[PDB]
Design an enzyme around this catalytic site. Structure first.
Site, PDB file in Angstrom:
ATOM      1  CE1 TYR A  52       0.099  -1.413  -1.726  1.00  0.00           C
ATOM      2  CE2 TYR A  52      -0.485  -3.427  -2.982  1.00  0.00           C
ATOM      3  CZ  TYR A  52      -0.694  -2.069  -2.673  1.00  0.00           C
ATOM      4  OH  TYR A  52      -1.726  -1.379  -3.260  1.00  0.00           O
ATOM      5  CG  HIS A  88      -4.121   0.817  -6.819  1.00  0.00           C
ATOM      6  ND1 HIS A  88      -3.728  -0.435  -7.259  1.00  0.00           N
ATOM      7  CD2 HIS A  88      -4.216   0.729  -5.474  1.00  0.00           C
ATOM      8  CE1 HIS A  88      -3.585  -1.230  -6.213  1.00  0.00           C
ATOM      9  NE2 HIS A  88      -3.874  -0.543  -5.125  1.00  0.00           N
ATOM     10  NE  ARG A 132      -8.024  -2.971  -7.224  1.00  0.00           N
ATOM     11  CZ  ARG A 132      -7.848  -1.787  -6.614  1.00  0.00           C
ATOM     12  NH1 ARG A 132      -7.108  -1.658  -5.510  1.00  0.00           N
ATOM     13  NH2 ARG A 132      -8.444  -0.727  -7.120  1.00  0.00           N
ATOM     14  CG  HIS A 168      -3.972   2.572  -1.350  1.00  0.00           C
ATOM     15  ND1 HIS A 168      -5.185   1.954  -1.167  1.00  0.00           N
ATOM     16  CD2 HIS A 168      -3.178   1.670  -1.969  1.00  0.00           C
ATOM     17  CE1 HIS A 168      -5.125   0.715  -1.643  1.00  0.00           C
ATOM     18  NE2 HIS A 168      -3.923   0.519  -2.139  1.00  0.00           N
ATOM     19  CE1 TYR A 213      -0.073  -7.409  -4.022  1.00  0.00           C
ATOM     20  CE2 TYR A 213      -2.484  -7.396  -3.641  1.00  0.00           C
ATOM     21  CZ  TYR A 213      -1.190  -7.823  -3.265  1.00  0.00           C
ATOM     22  OH  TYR A 213      -0.970  -8.689  -2.205  1.00  0.00           O
TER      23      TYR A 213
HETATM   24 FE   LIG Z   1      -3.663  -1.433  -3.116  1.00  0.00          FE
END
Ligand SMILES: [Fe+3]
Ligand SMILES: [Fe+3]
Ligand SMILES: [Fe+3]
Ligand SMILES: [Fe+3]
Lengths: 238, 202, 238, 238, 202, 202, 238, 202
Positions: free
Chosen positions: D106, D158, D155, D160, D145
């Protein structure tokens, strides 16, 4: 809305070119694989035919060739919808059909079958789909046709059809059959289609609520053509 | 999502429905045919002719052929053409024909097409799109006809250059001839075997 | 223990040479059947490669070509065992791998795909199996690769691998895929393999207990080569 | 047509506030039950955002932050429809998305993962749904992630998303996943949703006919918001 | 018992991993190549070269080839060789090469192999085992190269004599040539069609 | 009928997409923020500020907050408002903000809202609707902010009176303060524990 | 071989801390979630106990406390293997066991059950696993034990065991039961384990071929501990 | 792969098997206990003591505690320690104890541990790893004991700094006291509630 190319033809949903069980294909099928190309204006365009040039009985095979009387055979109405793969109606597409008569005899120089010819039946019609993609025509149900593949080969009753719609890439010729015909299970031509669900996509269904009392029966048959994708980012077509 | 209706052969009597006149059937007042030239059509008149051969080298006498092409300025008479240019108003751009039952020769009277834009700013050389239907052919076979006198344009054509076998590109080039004032382009199609014509999945 | 020949290759467990759905095979497949021969010293021998000539990062595709930084993409470790068909470990076999980067782009002159090139990724590695037949390498998960077979054909994410082991008869090149990739079901190349159980033998499995926290995920993939039979009576090899 | 209140939120179709397996929720979940209220103008109204203020690349995560070149990773288009629970299209709703890059990294001050940063990827976009409730954006598929819940938690890939539509009561933030990802089965965050059918409502489906040859793949993902009931008798809203 | 892992094509970029230098990738210090001759290698130096053709007669410019052979005395540099004789210590016996991207020519620098024992007391004529990998080739294709100057040996070779079509045996014989002092053996491979090279299931 | 798409946490990086500037990302020319006052906006300017605390009393430094409110005359700038009165044309009625990463303080610059009609002829006291999203919060938490100087209005508010625990109503009342000419309302939110803020299912 | 950290404990394979049906857990369970940490030398190391300090009857609960005669009850031998999650044997691990006597009575100051005490039974033993991870001990089968959870709660027959092995992270205390005991289905303590397959992992199986004629019956019970992963790239442990 | 054997409580009589002497059972000649100091053990002797409290603040009188720690130079008496340094040969590094049945106090006699390397070149502050088992505790609870006189080391400890709630870090710091020449560190454990001790999943 800016249109892009037609979705790729799914070759597994169609018969292969070489299909040994249909003997005539052995020498009329390319040995090389087809070459796939990215579409251009040439492939996404197609001609327009005008409604003004169609006669009043062009979709009425019972009357468009009747001279002294009506043709002999089962009076049937066939109707349905033409849509693209994304479910959008195909408007003003040219639909042409041809078939044998009630005896399974074609009005063609090269047909020597003993089934009797009908002086009041021609066997060809055409129509344009409307804005909802709907078409309807009336005809005589054709009889099954014996032909020489294996010596005792018989085609199920069938009607040939052709569509010229919005893009040259959608060009398509095929044949549909009638629900229940037992010859459907034995036909080498229908068996060139690899999957069962696709063979079933060519069977017109009896539509009993649409029969016209003391007059005609009715079959429902829908057709699906390739569909165009929409473009939202780069437009490479041109 | 739906699957495309599966193709089936046109069969040996494909003429009854697509060219009733060749079958000796008079049901329609207005009939479709192989003449794309109307009296006011613009451009140079050409005749396109040839034969279609099976794998033993014999001509198909039951074959049905259609062509689709742009007008003299490279514009298609289709609402889907996005060039913003006016198309020749006296041009359908399409025709249909059948081979002669005895000889197997087929022909069209049309106009030599102008160059049409290719993808991503490219320019395609002049060409006619052609499709073949017949008994034994399960799915209509697509090909294109280019012209041997358009050598520079052909050398830069995107589709021709996308055929890796340089030797196969030549099967798509019709030969110009001049029969008594008329310009004729000869284009023979070999469905199978040596010198097999390139067919496309479009 | 006196060794005899390798067991016959089971042709039904492999793709045929001619596979029309993979278009390039049409002109690159022999028309004649292969000629089977009884094995000689030529077929049961193979070269030896020395561990001394391998660099420290030869099995680390994340770092063996990194110049200014790390490559972009999903950090994954792939490991497993190489054994022969009778379950014996294959020791000191040369395993070579190659693949595209995270964008599905190959660092090859002939690749013009628009997926971005990664200046810090090369895409090739090699290693020798150990005494237990174990191998391990680290890489960036490759992205799926569009190519021209039908116009919109896409390869599932995949890694190419090659093995040179104890006998020339075991020589093998193949590709493995990643559990769950939906393109696995549509690939014409994977579909040249006739049986479902064999297509599944090429899918690497997620190995969650071997993930390294805040660092890399892990896939488990084992490989099976042809195995030699032992001789207890006549020894015809020589 | 006089509109009444939105249908009640079905709490059993959503995760509970307290979900011990997602550790951060333990101290950030109310102990008291929520207090349900009957809706007023405050709850059935919401702001309007104007199309004029959106830039041309706001829905193009591949290009909206590209400086020197294209981002590295898998090019994918995501599209679908936003409708309310009674099936009516949600027009001109503000859809905002955010995600990690191809490495699972990120672009956020607080992200210290070793997955490489991509100088040409930002990871955020927005768009307004059209009159049919349709939306489309293009991006790079994010990598999975790793995070600290249990030490080796990961994770699934994905994206958001957030919707501000016609009524404040429809306000919603969620995440969607990609068909086939094996981490979907192990994620504690996705498992806070009690029912299987609801976990499946967050998986975007591969849409193969909409892939753009030699360019991008495509995923289809539809979203359902709360719907308003119509009033035919007393109108108590005011 | 387990089934062999199924083969898959090497694909068009088989060079990235098998010959990184041909792809312009410098990751390895020591690289494998097409030169099997080391300075102290024993035997007569020969160059083996040719092209690989597809079914239309065009050369494959993306093909990868490897060869495996014995040393000058007919002994393989493999622990599996059971002859009890010492092998040339400066000989790997294997090499790999790719065709030139423009022309399609491939080549190896190696040594002419000595005769190797055949099964049941027989003797095989001198030969090199060769395998081909490429886009379109689902399983590596195995063949052998014999030498036209070893006529007597070839006549008695077990494998060559096991090919019933006497005319097909000739596709496995390379032609000796002498380019400026160097001995060159030309071996062209025809994957499909007329004069198709014999391929073996080994 | 369809089921609502299930909620999922906004996660710790909810700023990348909802407040790219706080994440140091410049992708949009026009950005959404915490300032609802435009130059011609009508009404009294107020600053709304506070912190959000977890169950151990520590402030959340990763929380995202949005508010929705009516203009100075109690009319929402929404097509769904049915009062038939004209709304302040220079008022969006919505804003979004994030807590300061170091301190946890959040704030908005807005206007004090006018009273809005309640159900069945009632009148609601002035209030701002607020929603909180954060890592650990599975579904956005809805609450309302009332004003301590609107004592008479609050006493008659339908929603406040529908909370049976009279002591919990006070958690929804912001405290008016006056920092150098500016009117500030302090509203701290306690997600869990003693003095836990009332949250609504709306 | 360079060892890395132990695989993460899979919390879903274990009972939660708070389990209302086992009443004593209500006040003895943390309210905060556990904090997961990355392992250090502290977590991967553990003490070593020497075989020299074990007495000859330490694994013989029938004789290690016998004074005037043998204990009353069913003579049973329990044996099995201790391995880690990757199947490797756990060598020289300290295994300690404790249990009630044949009456279901514990020799503990705080046990006031009326079941009779046995002056010749102690109820505790210990042993070290061998190189194959094997352990064996002999005892008297314990009787079921009534206790106060709900007023009429009864524990199935059971033996408590504890393992101290190679890493502190593997530290584990649990209880195993005997095949067929009907109280296994009703025990609130066994039901704190969420999954059925895990409850079954605590049931020792009757091992009839290993019964010793006219002497003792035999139960087989294997134990699985956390396993360490191997490191092949960076070694961050230190 | 196999799943870990699931944990179960130690139950109220965990002493029978782990500390038979506290249960008044003499079966073993050599017994394990709470004294880690042997006569030649190196380092400073310290006494570690405290109580374990349940959620109502009452001490557990049936709790069993074990500790694991390094020697005076920060080396573990374990084959798994990879520091390459010699460990104190007269140090087991582990002990076990039970709380007094009447009072609930537990204690160990040990040595203050030296600092141990942390991950990636870091250094951990001196600490003892501790685990608690009891009736009502389904899985042994792991925690660590740091020392209040090691303020600088604690400030740089990786594990302590990985606890985001700065206020919770203090629950892991034992208080140094000096009872008549002896150094005592008091460490009370609160299993549930206010000031709940941090427990780790290791
Ligand atoms: Fe996320
Ligand atoms: Fe027919
Ligand atoms: Fe590939
Ligand atoms: Fe017990």
């Amino acid at each position: 809305i800016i249109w892009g190319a037609y979705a790729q033809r799914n070759t597994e949903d169609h018969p292969p070119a070489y299909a040994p069980g249909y003997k005539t294909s052995v020498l009329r099928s390319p040995k090389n694989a087809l070459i796939s190309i990215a579409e251009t204006l040439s492939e996404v365009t197609a001609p327009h035919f005008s409604a003004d040039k169609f006669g009043p009985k062009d979709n009425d095979l019972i009357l468009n060739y009747a001279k002294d009387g009506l043709p002999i055979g089962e009076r049937v109405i066939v109707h349905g919808y033409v849509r693209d793969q994304f479910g959008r109606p195909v408007k003003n597409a040219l639909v042409e059909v041809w078939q044998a008569n009630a005896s399974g005899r074609y009005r063609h120089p090269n047909d020597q079958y003993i089934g009797a010819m009908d002086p009041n039946f021609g066997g060809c019609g055409r129509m344009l789909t409307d804005d909802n993609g709907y078409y309807v025509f009336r005809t005589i149900k054709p009889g099954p046709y014996p032909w020489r593949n294996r010596i005792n080969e018989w085609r199920p009753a069938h009607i040939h059809f052709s569509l010229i719609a919005d893009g040259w890439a959608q060009r398509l010729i095929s044949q549909f059959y009638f629900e229940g015909d037992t010859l459907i299970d034995s036909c080498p031509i229908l068996k060139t289609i690899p999957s069962e669900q696709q063979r079933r996509a060519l069977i017109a269904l009896e539509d009993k609520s649409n029969f016209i009392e003391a007059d005609s029966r009715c079959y429902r048959f829908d057709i699906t053509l390739r569909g165009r994708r929409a473009t939202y980012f780069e437009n490479d077509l041109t | 999502e739906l699957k495309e209706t599966p193709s089936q052969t046109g069969g040996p009597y494909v003429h009854i429905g697509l060219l009733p006149k060749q079958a000796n059937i008079e049901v329609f007042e207005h009939n479709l045919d192989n003449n794309l030239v109307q009296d006011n059509t613009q451009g140079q008149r050409i005749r396109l002719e040839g034969q279609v051969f099976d794998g033993l080298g014999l001509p198909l006498r039951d074959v049905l052929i259609e062509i689709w092409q742009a007008d003299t300025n490279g514009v298609y008479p289709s609402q889907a053409d996005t060039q913003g240019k006016q198309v020749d108003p006296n041009f359908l751009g399409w025709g249909r024909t059948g081979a002669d039952f005895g000889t197997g020769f087929w022909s069209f009277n049309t106009i030599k097409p102008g160059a049409v834009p290719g993808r991503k700013g490219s320019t395609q050389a002049p060409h006619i799109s052609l499709i073949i239907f017949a008994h034994g052919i399960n799915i209509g076979l697509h090909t294109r006809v280019y012209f041997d006198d358009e050598a520079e344009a052909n050398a830069k054509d995107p589709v021709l250059n996308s055929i890796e076998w340089a030797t196969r590109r030549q099967t798509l080039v019709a030969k110009r001839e001049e029969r008594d004032g008329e310009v004729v382009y000869r284009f023979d199609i070999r469905i199978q075997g040596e010198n097999e014509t390139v067919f496309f999945d479009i």
